[PDB]
Amino acid sequence: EAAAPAGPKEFTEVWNKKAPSTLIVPEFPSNYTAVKAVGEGQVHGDAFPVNFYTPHSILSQAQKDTVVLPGVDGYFGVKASHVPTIAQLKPGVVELHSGAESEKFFVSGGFAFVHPNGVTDICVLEAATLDQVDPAAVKSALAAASAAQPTDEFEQAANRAAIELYSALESAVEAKA
Amino acid sequence: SIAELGIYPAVDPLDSTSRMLNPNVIGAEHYNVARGVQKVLQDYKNLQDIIA
Amino acid sequence: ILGMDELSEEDKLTVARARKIQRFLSQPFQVAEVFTGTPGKYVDLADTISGF
Amino acid sequence: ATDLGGLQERITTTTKGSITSVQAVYVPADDLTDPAPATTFAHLDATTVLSR
Amino acid sequence: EILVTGIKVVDLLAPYQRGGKIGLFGGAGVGKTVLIMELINNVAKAHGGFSVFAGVGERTREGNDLYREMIESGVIKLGAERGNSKCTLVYGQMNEPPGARARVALTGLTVAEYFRDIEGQDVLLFVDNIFRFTQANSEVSALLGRIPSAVGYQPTLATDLGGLQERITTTTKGSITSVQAVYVPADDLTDPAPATTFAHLDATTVLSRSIAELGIYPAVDPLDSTSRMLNPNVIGAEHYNVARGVQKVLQDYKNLQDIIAILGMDELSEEDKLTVARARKIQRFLSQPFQVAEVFTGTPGKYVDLADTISGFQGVLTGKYDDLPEMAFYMVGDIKEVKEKADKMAKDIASRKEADNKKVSEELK
Amino acid sequence: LVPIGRGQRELIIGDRQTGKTAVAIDAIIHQKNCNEQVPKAQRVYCVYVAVGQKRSTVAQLVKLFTQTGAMRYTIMVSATASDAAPLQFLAPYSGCAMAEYFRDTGKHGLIIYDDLSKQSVAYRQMSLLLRRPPGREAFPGDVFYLHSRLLERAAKLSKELGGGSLTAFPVIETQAGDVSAYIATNVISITDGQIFLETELFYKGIRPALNVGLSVSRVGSAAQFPGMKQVAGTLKLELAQYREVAAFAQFGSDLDAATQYVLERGARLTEMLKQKQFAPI
Amino acid sequence: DVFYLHSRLLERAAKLSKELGGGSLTAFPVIETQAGDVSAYIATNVISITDGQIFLETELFYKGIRPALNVGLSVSRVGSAAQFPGMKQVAGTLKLELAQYREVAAFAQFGSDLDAATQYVLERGARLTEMLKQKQFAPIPIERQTVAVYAATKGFLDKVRVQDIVAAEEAVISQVNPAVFKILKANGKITPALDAHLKAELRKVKLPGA
Amino acid sequence: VGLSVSRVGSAAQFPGMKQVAGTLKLELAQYREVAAFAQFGSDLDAATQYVLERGARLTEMLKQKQFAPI
Amino acid sequence: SNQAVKQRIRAIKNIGKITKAMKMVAASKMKNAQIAVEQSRGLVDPFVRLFGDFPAVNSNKSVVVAVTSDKGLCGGLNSNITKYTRATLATTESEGKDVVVVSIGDKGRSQLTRIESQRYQLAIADTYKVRVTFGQASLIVEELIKHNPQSYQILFNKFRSAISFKPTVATILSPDLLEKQLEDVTGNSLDAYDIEASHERSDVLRDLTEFHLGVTLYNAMLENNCSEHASRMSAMENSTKSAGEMLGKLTLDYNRKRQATITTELIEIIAGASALM
Ligand SMILES: Nc1ncnc2c1ncn2[C@@H]1O[C@H](COP(=O)(O)OP(=O)(O)OP(=O)(O)O)[C@@H](O)[C@H]1O
Numbered sequence A: 001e002a003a004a005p006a007g008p009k010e011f012t013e014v015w016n017k018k019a020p021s022t023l024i025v026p027e028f029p030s031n032y033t034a035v036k037a038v039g040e041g042q043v044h045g046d047a048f049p050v051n052f053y054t055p056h057s058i059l060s061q062a063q064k065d066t067v068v069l070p071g072v073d074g075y076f077g078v079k080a081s082h083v084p085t086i087a088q089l090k091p092g093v094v095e096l097h098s099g100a101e102s103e104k105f106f107v108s109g110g111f112a113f114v115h116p117n118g119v120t121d122i123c124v125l126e127a128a129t130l131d132q133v134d135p136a137a138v139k140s141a142l143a144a145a146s147a148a149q150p151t152d153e154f155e156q157a158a159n160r161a162a163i164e165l166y167s168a169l170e171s172a173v174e175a176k177a
Numbered sequence B: 001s002i003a004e005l006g007i008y009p010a011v012d013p014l015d016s017t018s019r020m021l022n023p024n025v026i027g028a029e030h031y032n033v034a035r036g037v038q039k040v041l042q043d044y045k046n047l048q049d050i051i052a
Numbered sequence C: 001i002l003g004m005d006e007l008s009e010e011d012k013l014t015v016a017r018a019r020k021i022q023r024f025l026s027q028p029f030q031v032a033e034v035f036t037g038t039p040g041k042y043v044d045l046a047d048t049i050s051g052f
Numbered sequence D: 001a002t003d004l005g006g007l008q009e010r011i012t013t014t015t016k017g018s019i020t021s022v023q024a025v026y027v028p029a030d031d032l033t034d035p036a037p038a039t040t041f042a043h044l045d046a047t048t049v050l051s052r
Numbered sequence E: 001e002i003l004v005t006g007i008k009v010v011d012l013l014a015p016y017q018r019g020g021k022i023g024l025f026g027g028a029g030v031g032k033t034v035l036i037m038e039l040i041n042n043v044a045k046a047h048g049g050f051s052v053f054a055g056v057g058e059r060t061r062e063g064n065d066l067y068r069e070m071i072e073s074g075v076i077k078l079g080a081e082r083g084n085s086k087c088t089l090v091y092g093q094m095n096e097p098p099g100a101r102a103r104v105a106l107t108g109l110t111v112a113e114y115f116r117d118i119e120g121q122d123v124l125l126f127v128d129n130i131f132r133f134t135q136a137n138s139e140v141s142a143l144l145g146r147i148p149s150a151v152g153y154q155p156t157l158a159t160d161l162g163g164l165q166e167r168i169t170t171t172t173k174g175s176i177t178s179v180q181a182v183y184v185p186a187d188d189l190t191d192p193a194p195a196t197t198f199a200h201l202d203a204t205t206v207l208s209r210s211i212a213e214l215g216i217y218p219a220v221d222p223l224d225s226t227s228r229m230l231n232p233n234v235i236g237a238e239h240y241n242v243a244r245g246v247q248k249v250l251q252d253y254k255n256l257q258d259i260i261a262i263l264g265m266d267e268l269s270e271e272d273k274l275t276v277a278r279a280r281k282i283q284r285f286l287s288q289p290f291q292v293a294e295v296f297t298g299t300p301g302k303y304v305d306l307a308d309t310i311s312g313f314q315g316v317l318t319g320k321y322d323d324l325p326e327m328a329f330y331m332v333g334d335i336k337e338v339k340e341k342a343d344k345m346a347k348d349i350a351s352r353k354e355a356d357n358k359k360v361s362e363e364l365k
Numbered sequence F: 001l002v003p004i005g006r007g008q009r010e011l012i013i014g015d016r017q018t019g020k021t022a023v024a025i026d027a028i029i030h031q032k033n034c035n036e037q038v039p040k041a042q043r044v045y046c047v048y049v050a051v052g053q054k055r056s057t058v059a060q061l062v063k064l065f066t067q068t069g070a071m072r073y074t075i076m077v078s079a080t081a082s083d084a085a086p087l088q089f090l091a092p093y094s095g096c097a098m099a100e101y102f103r104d105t106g107k108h109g110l111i112i113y114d115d116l117s118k119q120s121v122a123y124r125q126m127s128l129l130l131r132r133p134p135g136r137e138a139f140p141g142d143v144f145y146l147h148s149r150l151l152e153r154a155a156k157l158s159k160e161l162g163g164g165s166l167t168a169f170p171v172i173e174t175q176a177g178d179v180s181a182y183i184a185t186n187v188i189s190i191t192d193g194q195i196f197l198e199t200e201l202f203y204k205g206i207r208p209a210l211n212v213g214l215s216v217s218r219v220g221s222a223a224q225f226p227g228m229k230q231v232a233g234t235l236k237l238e239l240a241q242y243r244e245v246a247a248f249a250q251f252g253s254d255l256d257a258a259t260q261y262v263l264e265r266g267a268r269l270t271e272m273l274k275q276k277q278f279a280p281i
Numbered sequence G: 001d002v003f004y005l006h007s008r009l010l011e012r013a014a015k016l017s018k019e020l021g022g023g024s025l026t027a028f029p030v031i032e033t034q035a036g037d038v039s040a041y042i043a044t045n046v047i048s049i050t051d052g053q054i055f056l057e058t059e060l061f062y063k064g065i066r067p068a069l070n071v072g073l074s075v076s077r078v079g080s081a082a083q084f085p086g087m088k089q090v091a092g093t094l095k096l097e098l099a100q101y102r103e104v105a106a107f108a109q110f111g112s113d114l115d116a117a118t119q120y121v122l123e124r125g126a127r128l129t130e131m132l133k134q135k136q137f138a139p140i141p142i143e144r145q146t147v148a149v150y151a152a153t154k155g156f157l158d159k160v161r162v163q164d165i166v167a168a169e170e171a172v173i174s175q176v177n178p179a180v181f182k183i184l185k186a187n188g189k190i191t192p193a194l195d196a197h198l199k200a201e202l203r204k205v206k207l208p209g210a
Numbered sequence H: 001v002g003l004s005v006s007r008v009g010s011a012a013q014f015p016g017m018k019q020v021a022g023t024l025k026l027e028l029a030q031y032r033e034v035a036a037f038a039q040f041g042s043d044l045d046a047a048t049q050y051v052l053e054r055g056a057r058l059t060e061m062l063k064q065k066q067f068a069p070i
Numbered sequence I: 001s002n003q004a005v006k007q008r009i010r011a012i013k014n015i016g017k018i019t020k021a022m023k024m025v026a027a028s029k030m031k032n033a034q035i036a037v038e039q040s041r042g043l044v045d046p047f048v049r050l051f052g053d054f055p056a057v058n059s060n061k062s063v064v065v066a067v068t069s070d071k072g073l074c075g076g077l078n079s080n081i082t083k084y085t086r087a088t089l090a091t092t093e094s095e096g097k098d099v100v101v102v103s104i105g106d107k108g109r110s111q112l113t114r115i116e117s118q119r120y121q122l123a124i125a126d127t128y129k130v131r132v133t134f135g136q137a138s139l140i141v142e143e144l145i146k147h148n149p150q151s152y153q154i155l156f157n158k159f160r161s162a163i164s165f166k167p168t169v170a171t172i173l174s175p176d177l178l179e180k181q182l183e184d185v186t187g188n189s190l191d192a193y194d195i196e197a198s199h200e201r202s203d204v205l206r207d208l209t210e211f212h213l214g215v216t217l218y219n220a221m222l223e224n225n226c227s228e229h230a231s232r233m234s235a236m237e238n239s240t241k242s243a244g245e246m247l248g249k250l251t252l253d254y255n256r257k258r259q260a261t262i263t264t265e266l267i268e269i270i271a272g273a274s275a276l277m
C-alpha cells in the first residue's frame, strides 16, 4: 500500500544516479509552496486562511472567519476548525466574511478544499462578482436555454449546465441588498 | 545581384533612370505604376535585413 | 525599456545626485547677459571643489 | 609634424608669462587616427567637447 | 618523398617534401623563428647530411644564440675536432647595410650549392627571413635611379627573387631541403614580396597572428597552409583523407564564425554545434609544445610521429573523443596524452585534501 | 556548368592553391584520351605556357605528361622564374605562335597560359626599367593591349581558312578573392567565360572548387554536348535553388519539407561534381 | 630603409662578451599606436627587431588598471633566464592564474552561470590584478615585490575585499619584519628556511577590513 | 534630414515656418531614432508607435512634386 | 574589397538596430507577461498541497510534456529542457513502461525527435501567437487525456526572475489508477477529506486530476512564455553588444583601408609624374 515512497526527496536519488552531472536536479512545484495540508497549526482561533483562486487572478489571500460556499448539495458554511472537505461547487455565490464586511463573488463552479490545518482553498474558474453582471442578458440567454433541446446528449449536457448556471444567477441578482 | 537571382535582363530597377519619367511626358497612369513599382521594391530592399 | 521604478532606491539616489550635478555644471555667462538678462557668475576653483 | 610642432611649440609658459591656446579640432572623415588629428592630439593637454 | 617533422599541423595538413622548398610565412612575432628552430632540432639532428644556416637580416642575438646552442649540441665543434661539425653559419644580420643583407643569402646558397654539386649530398638550407633579401634590394633600388613598382618595391622584384630561389633546388647530383622563413609586412599576405615568394615554394606554412592570440602555438593557419605532398598518390589514402576531413571541419567552423559572434552559440543546428565542438577540439589538438620552447614555457617538448598524428586526428574526426573537454587537447603530444591530461584535469577538480598538511608549525632547529 | 567550345577563351581565375593548374592539366590529359577515339580532323594539340613558374614544377608537369602519354600532343613553352623578364613577357606569344600552326592548318589547338599575371608582372618590370611612365598598380598603360592582342588570336576559323580552332585558357591568380584588381578585371573583360575557383569552397571538400554562381561561359550552351545539355539546365536550376535557399541552412531545426528537399537535392548535386584530380572523365 | 632606421639603432643594445668587458646596453623603444593597431608598419618593424614587447592596453587604462599591461600579449623571451630567482618561482604561478582569469572573464561576461570553481578564479584573478596596480614615480625594490606576489598567490591575501588590496599590500610590506627582505635580497631566492618563516610573518598581518 | 545642415537657419527663415519647424524637426528627430528599430509593426509600445505614426505622417507631408514650388 | 567593407559596416550597423529593437520588444512583452504569471502562480498551490508532489512514481504509462518556445531566438532555453526531458526519461524508464512524448512549441518538435523519435506522438504549437488562456490549456489537456496514462510529467522553465529560470518538472497522477494507490499510508491520506461531490470519490478525483493537469499546464506555459521573453531580452542584449563590437572593429579596419587607399593612389600618381618630369 505504501510500497513506493515517491517524492522530490527521493527523485533526487534516482536522478543523480542516472542523469549527467552538468544538470542539477530539476525543481518541483512543492518547492514553491510554503503551506501544506496536514501540518501543524494555521488556525489560531477564529480566522483561518482562505485562498480564493482563478487561473487569471488571485482574489483573496486574507484570513477570514467564515466562508459560504455553494456546493452541489447546497450552500454550506466553513467555520474555523471545519472538517476537511473536498467540495465540488455548483454555480453560486461565495461569501467571504470577516466581521461586518464580506465579499460576495458569484463563481462559475469549481472545487473548494478545506485542509486538516484549517487552510481553505476555493478554486473556481470565472469569479464574476455581482456588481459587474448584467441583469438583462441573463434572461436573453436562459430563454434559449429553456427552448433548445437537441438530438445529441452533448449539447443536452451543455444546455443543462446552461440552465443550472443561469437559474442560479437569477436567484442571486434580484435578492441583493 | 539581379543576375545571380537568374532574372534576365539583369536591369537594376532602383538604379535605372530616364528623363522620360516625367508625368508630363509618359502620362500619369504610367508614371504612377513605375513609381509604385520602385516604391514596393525599395521597401522590400529595406525589409530584406529582417526577412533574411 | 523597463521603467523608472524598476531599479533600486540607491539607484534613485544616483539619479537624483546626477541630475543635480548635471544642473550644477550649468553656468550663466557674463558675456551672454546682454541677451539673457541674468548676470554671469565667475566661479572660483575653491568654490566648485567644495560645492561638488 | 614639423609644421604643427613649429606652431604649437611656441605656445608654452615661459618665465615671463604664458600663452594658453584653445584650438578648435576638426576630425576628417570622423577618423581619430587620421594624421592631422593624430598629430594634433599629441600636443593637446585638455579637450573640451561641446555636445548637442 | 615526405619529411616527417614531428609537428602535428605540418605533418598532417601540409607535409614537407624531403628535397623541397619550405616556406614559413608570418609577420612580427607569430613564431616563425621558433618554428625554424624546432625544424632544425627535429630534422637537422636526424639528417646525416650537412646544414647551412643563412641568417639574412635577423637579430644578432638570435645568431649568437644559435651558434652557442649548436656548440653545446656538438653540431658545431671548435678547434681540433672542428671538421666533424655539421653546420655552416652565414650571417648577414639586421645591423648590416643594405648591400650586405641583399647578398648574404647568395653566400649561404653557394655554401649549400658546393655540397650539393661537388660533394654530391643532401643538405639543409635554413634561411631566416628571405624577405630581408627583397627588402634590402628595395632599399638599394631607390638609389639606383629606377621608377618604383607597386607598394614601394623595386621593379625587378620577381626576377631577383626568382633568380635567387631557382638555385635552391634538388638536382640529380644532390638535394637541398630549403626551409625559409618569410616575413609578411603589416600581416598582409597580398604584399608583393610574400605573394611572389608563394610561387617558389613546395610547402607553405602560413602562421597567423589571431591563431597565436588564441594561444594555439605553432600558430599555423591550417586553412592557408598548403603542400604539394597533400596528394593521395604521395602520402597515402587515409592520411590525405584525414587531412581533408580536418580541413573540412575547420572550414565549416570558419563559415559559422559570424553567427556565433552575433547571435550566440545557442542558435545553431545540432550538426552545426557538433561541428563547432569537433573544430574547437581539432584547433587545440593542432597545437603542440616545442622542445625549443621548453625554456620559456615550462612544458616538455612533444615529438609526435606521423602515424600518431593520423591515428589521433582520425579518432577526433570519427567521433571517438566527443567526451573529453576542449582543454584536454591543448598543448599535448598525441591521442594518449589527451586522455592522460583529461584524467589529470578531472582529478584536479576533485583535488581537495584535508588539514592543509602543515608539518611547518615550529620546526625544531 | 561552364561549357567550353573550340575557339573560345575561358579564364581560369582564382586564388593560390585552388585548382587552376589542375583544371588545365585535366583539360590536356583529356585531349590525350580523346585523340585516340577521333579521326585526325578532330584532334586537339595542347600547348602549355608556363610563365614565372619554377623549373621543378615544369619538370614535374613534363614527367606527368610523359607518364600519362600527353606529350605526343603537347608542347611546353616554359619561361621559368630565373629567366629574364623579356622571355617571360614573350613566352605567351611564343606559345600562341607555336599553337597557331594548328589553327592555321585546319587542325585544333588548346593553349594554356599558366600565370598570365606573371606575364603582366614581367611586362611591368620590362616597362618600368625602360622609363615608361607607370599607371595603376605601377603597370604600364598598355597592359590591357598586352593581353588583348594575345587572347584575340584564339579563334574558330571559317571554312575558307581551314576551319581550325584555338582554345585559350588564361590563368589569373588573385589576392584573397579580389577580382577587382587591374589585370584580373582586364582579362575578365577580354575572355569569353571565366572559371572562378574559391579558396573557401576548396576547403569545404568541393574540388574542383568552382564558384557556380560567378562562373560564366559566354558561348552559352550553344557549344555543349547534347544530352549533357538535357541534364545541365536542370542541374543549373536546382543548384541555383540550393544556393539561394541556403544562408538559412544553419537553422536545421525547422523542417520545411519544400526547402529541405531542395537543400538535400542540391547537396546530392554538389557532392556529385566533386572530382579527384589527374583523372578526367 | 625605415626598417634599417631602427635595426641599425636597436642592434647596438647588446650584452657584450667577457673578452670585451661584459658591459651591457638595455633599450626600451617606445611606439605609439593609433587604435590598438599593433599591425602597423612601424610597429611591426620594431616588433620584429626587439626581443620582448610591453603592450599597454587602452581599455585597461580607463578601468583604472595602471600600468595597463596586456598580460596576454606582453611577452619577453630573453628575460626568462633573467629574472630574480625569488620572483621566478612565485610569478610562475602569477601569470598562469591571470591566464585563467583571462579565460573566465572573456566568456562568462554574459552572466550565464557560476560554475563555483571558475567563480573562484574570477575573484582570485581580480586580486592578482589589484595587487599588480602601482602608482606613478614610486618604484618598488625586487624583494618588496616578490613578497607581495608571495602574499597574494599563496592565498594570504584571500578574502580581503578587492577595494582593499592597494591598502592591503601596503599593510604586508609595512608589517613584515624588514630582516625578511634582507635575506631574500641576498640569497636572491626564497630558500626553504625562509618561506616557512615568511608564511609565519604573513599570518601576523593586520589586513584591512578583516 | 539628419545629415543636411544649415548653420544660418537659426533666425533666417520665415517666422510662421519657425513657429512650426522646430516641432517638425524635433518630431522627425524621434522618428529617425525609432524608425529602423520598429520596421515590424507587431509588438509595439504606445509611445514609440505614436512617434512612428507621426513621423510617417510628416514624411509623406514633406514630399512634393517637381517643377511646382509652393 | 574597400567597398564590401562599407556594406558589411552598414549590415552590422543595421543588425545592431534590429536586435536592440527586439530587445526592447521582448522587454515590453516580459513586463506584462510577468503580471499574468504571478497571478497564475496561485492556483497551482492547492493541488500540490492536496495531492502532494510525487515525481518518482511507478507509472506503467507516462506522458511527458516539454514546454518550449515558438519563436526560436531565445538562447539555449529550449535545449535546456530538452536535456532535462532526456534526463527525466532516463529516470522513470527503468521498468519497461510506455512513454508518450508531446511538446508545446515548435522548438520542441524540432529538438525532441532528434533525441527520441518513436515515443514522440504529438506536437502542440502556435500557442503564444495571440495569448495563452485556460480554455486553450484545457483543450491541450483533453488531447493529452485522449491517451490513458497513469502519470503526466510537465517540463517547463519557471520564471524565478529576469535572470534565473529554474527548469521545473511537474507531476500529475491518474486518479484511482495511481493517485489513490500512491496515497495509501497504512490506510489512506485522502480519507480525512469529506467528499461533497454529486458522485463517488473516483469521479471527483477524475475531475480534480483533469483540473489539476489543466492548471499546471496553463501555469507551465505561462511561466515558460515569460521566461522565453526574459531570455530573449537578455539574449538580444548580448547580441547587440557583440554587434557593436564587431561594427567598431569593422569601422577601424575600414578607416585603415581608407587611409591606405588614399596613400596608394597618391604614391602611384607621384610615381607617374616623376617618371615624366
Ligand atoms: N580536384 C582536385 N582533387 C584533389 N586535389 C586537388 C584538386 N584540384 C587541386 N587539387 C590539389 O590542390 C592543390 C592546387 O594546386 P594547383 O595545382 O591548383 O596550383 P595553382 O592554384 O594553379 O597555382 P599555385 O600553385 O600558384 O597556387 C594541388 O596540391 C592539387 O594537387
Ligand SMILES: Nc1ncnc2c1ncn2[C@@H]1O[C@H](COP(=O)(O)OP(=O)(O)O)[C@@H](O)[C@H]1O
Binding pocket: E026, E027, E028, E029, E030, E031, E032, E033, E034, E035, E217, E218, E290, E293, E297, G047, G048, G075, G076, G077
Ligand atoms: N612555438 C611557440 N610556442 C610558444 N610561444 C611561441 C612559439 N613561437 C613563438 N612564440 C612566442 O612568440 C614570440 C615570437 O617567436 P619567434 O619565433 O621569435 O617569432 P618571429 O621570429 O616571427 O618574430 C616568442 O618570443 C614567444 O613569446
Ligand SMILES: [Mg+2]
Binding pocket: E032, E033, E058
Ligand atoms: Mg624572427
Ligand SMILES: [Mg+2]
Binding pocket: F020, F021, F114, F115
Ligand atoms: Mg599554377
